[PDB]
Structure 1
Amino acid sequence: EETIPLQTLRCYNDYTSHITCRWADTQDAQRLVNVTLIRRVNEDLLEPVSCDLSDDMPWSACPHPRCVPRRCVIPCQSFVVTDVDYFSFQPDRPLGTRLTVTLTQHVQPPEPRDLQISTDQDHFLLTWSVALHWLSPGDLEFEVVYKRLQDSWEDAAILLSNTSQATLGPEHLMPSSTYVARVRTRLAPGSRLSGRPSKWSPEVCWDSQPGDEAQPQNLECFFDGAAVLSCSWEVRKEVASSVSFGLFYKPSPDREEECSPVLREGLGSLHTRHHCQIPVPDPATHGQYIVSVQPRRAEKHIKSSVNIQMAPPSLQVTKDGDSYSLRWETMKMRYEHIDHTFEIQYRKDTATWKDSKTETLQNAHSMALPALEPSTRYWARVRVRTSRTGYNGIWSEWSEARSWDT
């Protein structure tokens, strides 16, 4: 982006005898290189310049906290409107490098492009062209790499072609996935030329044969060569939420087992990877396994006696004299012996259950009520639950609300 010496150099003259130059350097650079100010006479003569250290930089700022300013004086006997001095910096030693390139051994073939996919049933034909007689198409060979959209490039299958197309089939692709492919051009083993391969083409992207998107997929197993067979597979996040899969394995015929525990990991935004470690205690004897991912026996055990929601009680209102009493019955349970607790509530019509007189009774079937307001409409509800050590549950829904007036 332009040396610091060259940025900081300002050379001003008295237009009679002098030129004074001021330029700087960094210490950072000087631990590696030093440079002289050089002035040049004609297309040939290049004269050194005599500078000494200056503690200041009054003509230009130096962008770097570690500058070493210079100040130099160059004698002259002449100045004319057209005069231009040309200034340079020579480094303390020769620095450089060379390479002798034999073109035939330094070929980077052009990158493929116009990458394109067409389905033919369950195969996909991948075409591309290359912009190109020193390098003929027969010098070329192509390298295609493909992976599911959710995978590293790290882990991807290659496919080689001597022409500029390849067919990808069901031996290469898993069904109902999005695949990505890319292609680069390589020199042919047979070419009289070598170098290195092109940069990759841009990516093309496509869906494989539709199949069933719910099916778990990509079941893989690898044996450590000792005592463990590690299997992994994927299933859609949404399907794992309605279905519990297990891993089951059994030796192929010469009793069928569940692998446990299964660990889980995100795999992109739609799949979960699960892993399992199958123990193999004798790979010599039983060295072929048949392994399945399939629905587990996953049950919620629900003990009836301990999950009872009784039916709501029937409720009625009674007078008898001028004192009113609430009564309530619950459906006969064949002959069960089971204590019941009831919760009883009543409302002034113009008021809210939330803030109401809510007494609670074990094994009672009525409740006498206090005296109450002149000619008001009233409401009442009851609910039951079991209340005995063999038993448990939730309240019954409320009885129908029973109205009435004074």
Structure 2
Amino acid sequence: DPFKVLQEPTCVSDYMSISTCEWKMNGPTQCSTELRLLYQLVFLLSEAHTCIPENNGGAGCVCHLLMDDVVSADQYTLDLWAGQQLLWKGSFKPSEHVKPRAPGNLTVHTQVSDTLLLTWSNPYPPDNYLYNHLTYAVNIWSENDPADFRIYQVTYLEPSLRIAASTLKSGISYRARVRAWAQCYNTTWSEWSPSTKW
């Protein structure tokens, strides 16, 4: 079996605890058995860590490199282990590929003046750097007609949005999800939160 890396390992960081690396082999594989992912903080006084990859498409795989915390300067030596044999030596800077954690606990509440109030939770603790630098996007759309949609932009600190119900059909049901990104790190968007309906 010519073991090969058909797709160079990519990686993203939640800038909190977990990083995510994905790569694709040139054939189906059981990474839980064959592949090992050794990563070390190039803050050398620091120990290398083993990562047991999980199948990500029968021919692709993914590992989760656990971490205490992360800072801009941080950089990592990455090496992909079979067995003994090669290949991948790689460098990674979590700072460069931030993929913010998804927001959550999203609900809808009825307020006075026939206005609606949506609320969600910031995915980070107040200590974390991103905590103050998350701008959200609320996505409200109708299931009946997915063409009848609406998208809002939240740039303030309070994870909340209040709109006038006069903007709804008064009739149909709506689903709504939020996601986040830090403009301060020029990050990709997060994953959409568990959509709600009301």
TM-score, normalisation: structure 2: 0.49
Q: Which has the larger radius of gyration?
A: 1
Question: Relative contact order, CA 8 A, sep 6+: which one is greater?
Answer: 2
